[PDB]
Amino acid sequence: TVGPKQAITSEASTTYIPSRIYSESLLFKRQEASLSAMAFLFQEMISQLHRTCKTAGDFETKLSDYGHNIGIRLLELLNFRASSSNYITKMRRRDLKILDILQFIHGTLWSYLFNHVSDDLVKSSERDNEYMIVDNFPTLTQFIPGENVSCEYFVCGIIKGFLFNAGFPCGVTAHRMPQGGHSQRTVYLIQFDRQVLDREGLRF
Amino acid sequence: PQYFAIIGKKDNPVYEIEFTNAENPQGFPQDLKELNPFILHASLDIVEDLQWQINPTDNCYLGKVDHFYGLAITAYISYSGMKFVMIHGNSANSSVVIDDNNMRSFYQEVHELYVKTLMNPFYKITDPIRSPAFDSRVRTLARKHL
Amino acid sequence: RSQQKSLGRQMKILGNFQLLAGRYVDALNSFVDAITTLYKVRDYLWLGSALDGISICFLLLSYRNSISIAAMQSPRNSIMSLSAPALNIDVENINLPLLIKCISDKVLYYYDLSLMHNSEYAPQVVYCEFLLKTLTFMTSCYKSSEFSKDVLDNIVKNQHRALSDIPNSPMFPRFEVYFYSNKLFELQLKEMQVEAQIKIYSTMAEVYRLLGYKR
Amino acid sequence: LQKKILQLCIKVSRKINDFEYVAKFSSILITKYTHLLNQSEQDALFKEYIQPSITNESI
Questions:
Q1: Going by fewer Cβ within 10 Å, which terminus of chain D is more open, N or C?
Q2: To 5 degrees, how large is the angle CA B3–CA B5–CA B6?
Q3: Which of B3, B85, B112, B122 is the mutation pick for testing A, counting most A CBs within 10 A?
Q4: Does Transport show up as a keyword for this record (chain A)?
């Protein structure tokens, strides 16, 4: 079914089964590698990005693109495991609005990744296009001295690709603010665009 | 005489295929070109303004949706972005037969073949699939449910 | 049945004649030559309404099947024109609502509701035109079509209710059953005349471009 | 879809004879496409359609 070729094929009156040349299970396996190993993986990745890139903002984008690579991928089978081989009962509801899908990061994205829950999902005071999630003690960047906050844009990239498939294009930033005795908690103050806010603003 | 499409977010067909019953032994001669993208392009229009509302609890599957003046169409919307469309029907009769549950056990069943190909990290979005194996799998997966 | 035919032809001709000859353009109202009409500034189809009421009553009492939907067309045009534009809150459609009770589609009390109801009534009566097998408007008597009048019937329907779904969204909305109720061209439509096809596809395309359904 | 809808636009512009539009849209068909046009799907029976463009002053 090539782009150059047409949609042409042949009749159904034979059997191609199984011909899996490679098709397997896809279930939630558990192998649980050490945080030192993945921390070294992230470590030499950030070393490559400070090698090859000029200044602050382009490095921030050239970090968040990895999150945009695999955010779509984690979205669709995390939803296919949570809201649903595959002797399937059903697939449940999609994103209704913004407040179920940023509950869906809050419910089962962090507990898919980091075995806990980010502690709040605060709807903002002054506006509604801006939303803010704070992780309390970020797991994959706990060793980096976070005075530059440029090193946590893995996870701003990974949630932006959780919402760009969801139809909400969104400016996603991170800041870090020590509001509690919990130190080095990072706020992901996200935004949206006006238009799916106005698609929410048609009826709410 | 059955016609599969997977049509993307920026209108690109990431997988589109026909097949035929040998009891028809061909498919829609001289009708195979109007029953292509334009009908499917309007099908993208009706699933575009049918997905985002709750109401015209199974948000993914939608069943038979519309009808041009020779046949009728069915649909499916995934949260991956993609909108699966099968176009079925013998060209002589107006084919009424929407099985609605056993071909519901096709759309959630072809979904994982899209999943494992999406999980190929060399595979991008917005590019079609010349898998020699996943297209030979689906006709035999349609050998389950004709 | 001869009395029914005589009353049908006379009532249809009188309904269309007193319709088009009352308030054709009545913003200056040249009151000379007052033979065929009142023709003053207060002459807006009132005798046309009374004549169309008696015409629809005699058409229902005639019991046609082909020409009889033109009585509903006359009453719907009366309640559209003389009870919308130059109405001045008169809306004298009591025998029109009586014919809505008698033949089809009573029980409505709003603008864009009873017009839709009587449009459904006239569409059902033209569906009840099963086989006239004759010639009534005698422009064509052997090569003509009931298709060629029914496409004009529902495009009158489509232009007179498709605009009511405003493109300011929340202002005057109804459900998007316009496409659902627009897929009604099951007929063949293979070139009776090319300008009918051009105006039918221009309006069918223009309403989709109006409602934002491009494809 | 662009191949089919430009083929329809080129056939209208033949039948109604707007020669700068058969010039414009067939030049845009040849430039922006034809990796999917071998000597079949009317490319051999095409370019006869644009020698009237070049015997005109069009392109």
A1: N
A2: 165
A3: B112
A4: yes
Name which of D24, D21, D25 is nearest D7 in CA terms: D25
Cβ atoms of C76 and C118 closer than 8 Å: yes
Q: Are D14 and D49 in contact (CB under 8 A)?
A: yes
- Cβ contacts of A115 within 8 Å, gap of 6 or more: none
The yes-or-no reply on A/B contact (3 CB pairs or more, < 8 Å) is: yes
CB of B37 within 8 Å of a chain D CB? The answer is yes
Q: Is B41 on the interface with D (CB under 8 A)?
A: yes
The alpha-carbon radius of gyration of chain C (Å, integer) is 18
Taking CA B89 as the corner, what is the angle to CA B88 and CA B93, rounded to the nearest 5 degrees? 165
Burial class (CB in 10 A: 0-12, 13-18, 19+), A90: middle
Instruction: Name chain A contacts of D35, Cβ cutoff 8 Å.
Output: 4
Phi-psi region of C105 (alpha: psi -120 to 50; beta: other; left: phi over 0): left
Does the beta-carbon distance from C215 to B49 stay under 8 Å? no
Sort out which chain D residues have CB atoms less than 8 A from A1's CB and list them. none
| Torsion angle, alpha carbons of C17, C18, C20, C23, to 10 | 160
A21 and B113 in contact (C-beta within 8 Å)? no
Task: Please check whether residue B46 touches C, CB under 8 A.
Answer: yes
Q: Which of C185, C186, C215 sits opposite B42 (nearest CB)?
A: C215
Q: How many CA atoms lie within 13 A of A97 on its CB side?
A: 11
Phi-psi label, residue D17: left if phi above 0, alpha if psi -120 to 50, beta otherwise = left
**Interchain contact, B45 vs C176, CB within 8 Å:** no
The 8-class DSSP code of residue A122 comes to P
Owner of token pair 């005349």? C193
First to last CA, chain B: 10
Q: For residue C128, count other CB atoms closer than 10 A to its CB.
A: 13
The C-alpha atoms of residue A204 and residue A74 are separated, in whole angstroms, by 28
| Chain B residues 55-74 with a CB less than 8 Å from chain C | 66-69
User: Using CA atoms, how far apart are residues D23 and D4, in angstroms rounded to an integer?
Assistant: 17
* Element spanning C150, H or E: helix C147-161
